[PDB]
Amino acid sequence: ERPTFYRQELKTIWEVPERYQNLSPVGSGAYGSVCAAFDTKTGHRVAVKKLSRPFQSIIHAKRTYRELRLLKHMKHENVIGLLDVFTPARSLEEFNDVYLVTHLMGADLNNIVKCQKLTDDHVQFLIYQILRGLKYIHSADIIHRDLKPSNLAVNEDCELKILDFGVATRWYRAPEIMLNWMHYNQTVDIWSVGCIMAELLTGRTLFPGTDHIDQLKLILRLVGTPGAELLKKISSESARNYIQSLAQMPKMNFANVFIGANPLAVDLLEKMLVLDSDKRITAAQALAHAYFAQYHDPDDEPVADPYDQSFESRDLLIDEWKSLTYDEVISFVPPP
Ligand SMILES: Nc1c(C(=O)NCc2ccc(C(=O)N[C@@H](CCC3CCCCC3)C(=O)N3CCNCC3)cc2)cnn1-c1ccccc1
């Protein structure tokens, strides 16, 4: 039974089920067209995102479908999930707007740290949750690709979720992406986690580059010029020359960069900030690292159901993407 909707303005107009009350814009553009609301069904505050021009073009329609598919798939404590999705339309013919309802978080990870060191216990808890969510995301063959403190949100009980509010900042970007090395694996996200973890411990950005070149120079000063093993995997002579032109010395010992830090934290940072992404620790491996002994539970670090992203390879018409999106709205099943 279709609930009754009500309209509102909010310089953006919102038609939502009566279920959602007390709507108010939040983030003022940083979050998009997002309002906080009171979910009368559960008595919890929620976030309502209205999609912008979802079916204006093939690209818009496919992006709308993609985001709905991703959100419908993510069912994990440390990843943003879909509480509801709705449209005022009563038919595919009238279908032109999509609203996504998620949990409302309280702050991102810039708001928690505020340029001050966190305790080592608190860093364990925060990074453990990030890695727990990444193990889940990566098990579905999904790569975040833009992990950074602003895409990590917490509530008052310090419970953390991974989202994507999106390039804005390069401070957390893996060197292989910056170098256009083309073959990326999931540990580009592990690089970002390493940068975040270092920042939580020290209160300082690990690699605060002024521009693209400076960012790579700062990275390579810490992690060193490519070793012989990594150089063997670089096809292009110009590519080999270019990376060496930005570097010089071997890597530094992280034990003499993170003075006063838990030696287990330093060991983990070493394994996350490896230049060769083939040698970089995975999320599942990192969760078993002794640094997380007080939080690690091998039986509550779940993986995702298989995620069918064969649609990514397809060239469909605008009405086909729209119909596929409409079918995914209809088939949605709320959580418990
Ligand atoms: N602003 C918000 C919200 C909110 O916007 N919720 C709506 C809300 C919808 C959607 C998303 C979201 O992340 N959507 C992803 C798909 C899921 C991703 C989860 C991780 C792994 C990779 C996939 C996506 O496809 N796109 C399209 C391209 N650009 C980026 C987003 C976030 C959020 C929820 N809480 N808060 C909040 C309030 C105060 C302080 C801090 C946060």
UniProtKB/Swiss-Prot annotation:
UniProt keyword annotations, A-Z: Acetylation, Apoptosis, ATP-binding, Cytoplasm, Kinase, Nucleotide-binding, Nucleus, Phosphoprotein, Serine/threonine-protein kinase, Stress response, Transcription, Transcription regulation, Transferase, Ubl conjugation
Enzyme class name: transferase
Enzyme Commission (EC) number: 2.7.11.24
Tissue-level expression: Macrophages, monocytes, T- and B-lymphocytes. Isoform 2 is specifically expressed in kidney and liver.
Subunit structure: Component of a signaling complex containing at least AKAP13, PKN1, MAPK14, ZAK and MAP2K3. Within this complex, AKAP13 interacts directly with PKN1, which in turn recruits MAPK14, MAP2K3 and ZAK. Binds to a kinase interaction motif within the protein tyrosine phosphatase, PTPRR. This interaction retains MAPK14 in the cytoplasm and prevents nuclear accumulation. Interacts with SPAG9 and GADD45A. Interacts with CDC25B, CDC25C, DUSP1, DUSP10, DUSP16, NP60, SUPT20H and TAB1. Interacts with casein kinase II subunits CSNK2A1 and CSNK2B. Interacts with PPM1D.
Highest taxon listed in the record's lineage: Eukaryota
GO molecular function terms attached to this record: ATP binding; kinase activity; MAP kinase activity; mitogen-activated protein kinase p38 binding; NFAT protein binding; protein kinase activity; protein phosphatase binding; protein serine kinase activity
A single cellular component GO annotation: cytoplasm
Active-site residue numbers: 164
Name of the molecule in the record: Mitogen-activated protein kinase 14
